[PDB]
Amino acid sequence: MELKHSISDYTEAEFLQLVTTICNADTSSEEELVKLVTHFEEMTEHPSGSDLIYYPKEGDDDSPSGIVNTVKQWRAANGKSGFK
Amino acid sequence: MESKRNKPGKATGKGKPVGDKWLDDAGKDSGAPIPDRIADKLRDKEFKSFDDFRKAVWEEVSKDPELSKNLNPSNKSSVSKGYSPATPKNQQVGGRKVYELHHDKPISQGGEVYDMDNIRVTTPKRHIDIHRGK
C-alpha cells in the first residue's frame, strides 16, 4: 500500500524530469519504470493514463515537454490543481 | 518440483512471419507469435532463465526496424533497454502494463520453456481473458 501521489507536490521542472525519465526509460529496471508510469498516471488524473506517453492522440506532441504541456492544459480545462 | 523457467536452456523454434502491426494481434486470438526474424536471431542460443530470454526478445525487437517501427519514441526507448513495451491503457491489468510472453502449452503439461513456437506475445488483458476461460 502507498497513498496516491499528488501533482501539486511537484514543480513543473520536477514533473518534466519525471516525464523525461519515463520517455527515455532511464531506469534501473523495467519494474522501476512501470512504477514511475503508475505514479505519473496517479498525478495527472488523466483518464488516458499511460497512453499520454505511449499512444498519443494524432496531433499531440509526445516529447517530454509535449506531454507536460498536454497534462497542464487538461488539468487547467478540468478545474484541477496545477504544479507547485 | 523445481521450476524449469528458472533454469538455463537453449532457444529453439521457427516463429512466424508477422507484419509491422504485429503487436495489435497480441490483444486478439491466442496472441501474436514470436516473429520469425526474432527466432532466427535467438535460435540455438543459451539463456540463463526465461526472464533472460524475455529480455533478449525485446532487445531483438529494438534492433529490427520493421518490428519496432510502430512503437512510439517512448516505447522504442523501453525496448532499447530490453524492457517490454507498454500496451494501450485498455489492454492493461492493474500493474501489468506491458506485453507478456506466455507459453501456449503449459510447461507443466509438456510444453517447452524456450521453444519459440510454444510462446505467444499477449497483452495482459488478452492473457487474463484466455486464462479465465480455461
UniProtKB/Swiss-Prot annotation, chain A:
Q: Which GO terms describe its cellular component?
A: protein-containing complex
A Pfam match: Colicin_Pyocin
**This protein's UniProt keywords:** Bacteriocin immunity, Plasmid
- Keyword field contains Acyltransferase: no
Q: Which InterPro entries match?
A: Colicin_E_sf (IPR035900), Colicin_pyocin (IPR000290)
Q: Which GO terms describe its biological process?
A: bacteriocin immunity
- Is this entry keyworded Chaperone? no
Recorded GO molecular functions are: protein domain specific binding; toxic substance binding
Which family does the UniProt entry place this protein in?
A: Belongs to the colicins ColE2/ColE8/ColE9 and pyocins S1/S2 family.
UniProt function note = This protein is able to protect a cell, which harbors the plasmid ColE9 encoding colicin E9, against colicin E9, it binds specifically to the DNase-type colicin and inhibits its bactericidal activity.
Q: What is this protein called?
A: Colicin-E9 immunity protein
> What species is this protein from?
Escherichia coli
Curated annotation (Swiss-Prot), chain B:
Q: Where is the composition biased (Basic and acidic residues)?
A: 17-28
Question: What is a GO molecular function of this protein?
Answer: metal ion binding
The GO annotation for biological process reads:
defense response to bacterium; killing of cells of another organism
Cellular component annotations (GO), alphabetically ordered: extrachromosomal circular DNA; protein-containing complex
Record: residues binding Zn(2+): 102, 127, 131
Renumbered residue ranges of the record's region Disordered: 62-94
Where are stretches of biased composition, namely Low complexity?
68-81
Q: Does the keyword Mitochondrion apply?
A: no
Keywords (alphabetical) are:
Antibiotic, Antimicrobial, Bacteriocin, Endonuclease, Hydrolase, Metal-binding, Nuclease, Plasmid, Zinc
Q: Which family does it belong to?
A: Belongs to the colicin/pyosin nuclease family.
- Functional summary from the UniProt entry: This plasmid-coded bactericidal protein is an endonuclease active on both single- and double-stranded DNA but with undefined specificity. Colicins are polypeptide toxins produced by and active against E.coli and closely related bacteria.
This one is known as Colicin-E9
What is the species of this protein?
Answer: Escherichia coli
